[PDB]
Design a protein around this ligand. Structure first.
Ligand code: NAG
Ligand code: NAG
Ligand code: NAG
Ligand code: NAG
Ligand code: NTJ
Ligand code: NTJ
Lengths: 532, 532
């Protein structure tokens, strides 16, 4: 039967799922690791012991233990990102959508969810791989990985809680895909990893980490890159947060062994309840437990790896959304609310600047403020609002990515860059938030093709164009069809810095994505803070 | 006779001069001080001893000893600013144009020439007061003052060369006008001083200096303000330059008395020949011998005087030209030449940035470069040229003036601000230099009314409008006619920061003259240099 697949770990039985008047196969909740529970909490993942009998792969697995957004109870705009299955520490599972009839050896895409390394689920409605797998004839995998303290508590030098284990979870899923996807009709040597936000940064981190490079062919990064200021901490800072966590739970702090032991007796929600108290600054766009630059997973600093070409050399496709900042300003910054226009006073602008660049001294904040203020009109609340939006997105997403782009391209084999600036017509978040980060995912996963979801015709066209770009790139390393028309997505190069925008209008090519602001963020402001 | 005036210093006989098909009286080369020659070189001026008989005031006096521009021999664009009379240390004279028949008690305007405190002449063709005096029925005075080492060699604590004596020359001329202008039909209590460039800065310095305030009613400043970075040095820096000068002339440097004595035995041209070797930095827009903040003429620093309201409170009218920077880039910066378009490479841009901000460290130069570079297009030689033009003008003229404007207005009785951006149709300097500083003077002195000078009709209109603004302001403290139409030059205020532009188009009102760049120059860059 087409729903039964013998893998090196044992047999699995999937389920036929309907999709757009046809059907395909889905194998849901396949374990790729031992449950990281009990004395294995905080440990590196172990491979799943093989099983006899048939593993029932017909339903979604649990989601990992995580903070749950209750800012807007009942609001679909926020609820659509919360876990939709029971949370559990037993959560290391993957899901596979397979064209029907089963391919013999086709392109494979593996999805890595975002969520600030503190949240995320493989089972969200908007991550349903059936439309992509069916439309583009790819084998679609989504993995899972521990988040929060469970994934990234870092007590460096200890083997019980070394850090980065959520990243090692991702790699174990990629190892399982490498070893077994051939039995689902996938080509293990044509695997594209792709992810958004912290998943985009995760993708970039596997490009860098030597122990991950050989497990995939090429990479797509959306709204995230490994060098983002929120995506890693030093070994000393990871240590400090781990101790501060045990201090919040009245733990014995006399040794790593005492500390880790206390944290493993706590119920998961006790860890989640205090996770946010360990941050060093009053800040936005910063998360407690994130990857650590440990000298093992990352051999040296990200910047010297980027400078020296110490990373996988392949093709990449990556890009950003227009309004990366609005979500985190909405949730953490004074003056912004969901039900108003969020016109920002000059005082609230300055508070926002302080929260957005928490490591800066006063001279640095003056520089950021000068850079983003229209001094002909400094009390325009629209401009103050949009100015803060740009500050948060430039600093945390766009300019880190553009730095990564420019360093990668010197050594890589092909870079394609996009700027997604279409705002979906059925968006429930207020207009002032614009093209909100994560809201290209639904176009990538093909949701506008489902008519009951009330997208425009042009949005359906845009989704089909994006899905065909991502899948053609996965298959060939180039998002363009060889011998079709449609104006070509140009290669990003060191001299042109060409990119396209993605929206419902006929595509245009531009150059030097936000170069003016990113010279400020990537070159000037670091030198200023270094001097003061 | 109308050409004979008995003054408190003795009788003077002037000359009838023709002007635009009529005539007026001119009294040229009236001495207001003893010749500052011999052992009086570098000394404070002494008042002119009265004379018997009639002083022949029918011809222009000598000009003061000064550096003479030979960069473009024969070129009228430069030659029109050089001395047109014999140079001599015997040069403290003034000139008066008087309407005919002689007024009984009319508005008085006193002109102070610019020239970087190192040059200038009261007798230039473009300073001919007959058109203004005749057209606006004012009594027009132009004074003179020592420049160069002769005017500003500063050995503080010495009474033989205390500094600022060129400024004291100006004040002695103003004292003479105060005491005697009534006999020429002038109203001594309605005197307006006005000057361009270093003369504008001179005007501002008399506003500040307590010993000058009572000698005039109101003030006009063109393209200069007392706080300009080139317009003053500290007492220690003035001392260092004075010693460096004597060192260039093999002077005994064991004491102030030995040093001053050696400098007084040198012929004037020996001083001029080495004057430029004493500058501390490789720089543009900096001059060797300039006013010194001495604790007497200026009681404390200019900035604390401005902050505390320690200055004359009256009405002022002031403004700038659009392209303040081009002259000094032409003369001192690599890549600029008179006969080409002066498209600037990125290397020459950076050299220019270094010359323009000589006191800055590398972080500061990076800030200036970032601020003025279009990073979408950083190899456009037009933009690099115009960018450097703006750097030089913003830093040296516009943003100092705007700082002065904003500090003065908090305490003054009326501020009018202008932006002169008409380029004269008969300008011989190349197009890339734009609206060059000093080239509003000819409109102020009414030269477009002389038909043989080949101005357009509209330029003649513009000159008449400007002359009527300056003279109405001098008479009343407001450049607008009470009960005429013509859209009104608005008052500059702390909240609007309204100004007008002056050109041949129907005037427009704007707000916040170059506020974005001047927040950089006046607030950010000082705090950055202070921190590094
Ligand atoms: C697989 O598990 C689901 C979970 O309830 C169950 O409903 C389904 O019948 C199972 N299928 C089997 C055991 O074949
Ligand atoms: C990709 O690699 C091949 C061979 O390694 C090379 O011929 C080709 O030019 C590369 N493409 C780019 C864009 O570097
Ligand atoms: C005034 O001086 C000039 C200078 O040469 C002379 O030509 C003129 O005749 C003199 N007028 C007198 C002395 O009345
Ligand atoms: C000028 O001064 C007078 C009285 O000193 C005052 O009534 C008037 O308002 C002042 N004008 C301005 C613009 O300050
Ligand atoms: P991403 O993972 O999405 C926010 C939850 N972010 C850039 C951290
Ligand atoms: P100004 O006096 O004119 C240049 C000779 N300048 C701003 C110093």
């Amino acid at each position: 039967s087409e729903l039964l697949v013998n893998t090196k770990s044992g047999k699995v039985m999937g389920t036929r799922v309907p999709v757009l008047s046809s059907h395909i196969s889905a194998f849901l909740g396949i374990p790729f690791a031992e449950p990281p529970v009990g004395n294995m909490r905080f440990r590196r993942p172990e491979p799943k012991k093989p099983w006899s009998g048939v593993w029932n792969a017909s339903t979604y697995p649990n989601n990992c233990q995580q903070y749950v957004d209750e800012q807007f109870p009942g609001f679909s705009g926020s609820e659509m990102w919360n876990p939709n299955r029971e949370m559990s520490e037993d959560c290391l599972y993957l899901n596979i959508w397979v064209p029907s009839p089963r391919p013999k050896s086709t392109t494979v895409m593996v999805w890595i969810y975002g969520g600030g390394f503190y949240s995320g689920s493989s089972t969200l409605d908007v991550y349903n791989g059936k439309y992509l797998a069916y439309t583009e004839e790819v084998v679609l995998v989504s993995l899972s990985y521990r988040v929060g303290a469970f994934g990234f508590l870092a007590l460096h030098g200890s083997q019980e809680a070394p850090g980065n284990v959520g990243l090692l979870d991702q790699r174990m899923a990629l190892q399982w895909v490498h070893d077994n996807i051939q039995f689902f009709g996938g080509d293990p040597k044509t695997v594209t990893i792709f992810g958004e936000s912290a998943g985009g940064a995760s993708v970039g981190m596997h490009i860098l980490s030597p122990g991950s490079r050989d497990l995939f062919r090429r990479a797509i990064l959306q709204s995230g890159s490994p060098n983002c200021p929120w995506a890693s901490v030093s070994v000393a800072e990871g240590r400090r947060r781990a101790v501060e966590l045990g201090r919040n739970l009245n733990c014995n702090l006399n040794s790593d062994e005492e500390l880790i032991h206390c944290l493993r007796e706590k119920k998961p929600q006790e860890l989640i309840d205090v996770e946010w108290n360990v941050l060093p600054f009053d800040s936005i766009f910063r998360f407690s437990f994130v990857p650590v630059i440990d000298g093992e997973f990352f051999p040296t600093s990200l910047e010297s790896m980027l400078n020296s070409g110490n990373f996988k050399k392949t093709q990449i496709l990556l890009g950003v959304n227009k309004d990366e900042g609005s979500f985190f300003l909405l949730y953490g910054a004074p003056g912004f609310s969901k039900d108003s226009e969020s016109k920002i006073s000059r005082e609230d602008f300055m508070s926002g600047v302080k929260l957005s660049v928490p490591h800066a001294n006063d001279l640095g904040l003056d520089a950021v403020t000068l850079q983003y203020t229209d001094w002909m009109d400094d009390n325009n609340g629209i401009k103050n609002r949009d100015g803060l939006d740009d500050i948060v997105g430039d600093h945390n997403v766009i300019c880190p990515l553009m730095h990564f782009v420019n360093k990668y391209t010197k050594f890589g084999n092909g870079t394609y860059l996009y700027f997604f600036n279409h705002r979906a017509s059925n968006l429930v978040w207020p207009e002032w938030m614009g093209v909100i980060h994560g809201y290209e995912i639904e176009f990538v996963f093909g949701l506008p093709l489902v008519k009951e979801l009330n997208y425009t015709a042009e949005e359906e066209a845009l989704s089909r164009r994006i899905m065909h770009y991502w899948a053609t790139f996965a298959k060939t390393g180039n998002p363009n069809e060889p011998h079709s028309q449609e104006s070509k997505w140009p290669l990003f190069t060191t001299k042109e810095q060409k990119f396209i925008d993605l929206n419902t209008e006929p595509m245009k090519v531009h150059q030097r994505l936000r170069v003016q602001m990113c010279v400020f963020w990537n070159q000037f402001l670091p030198k200023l803070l270094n001097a003061t």
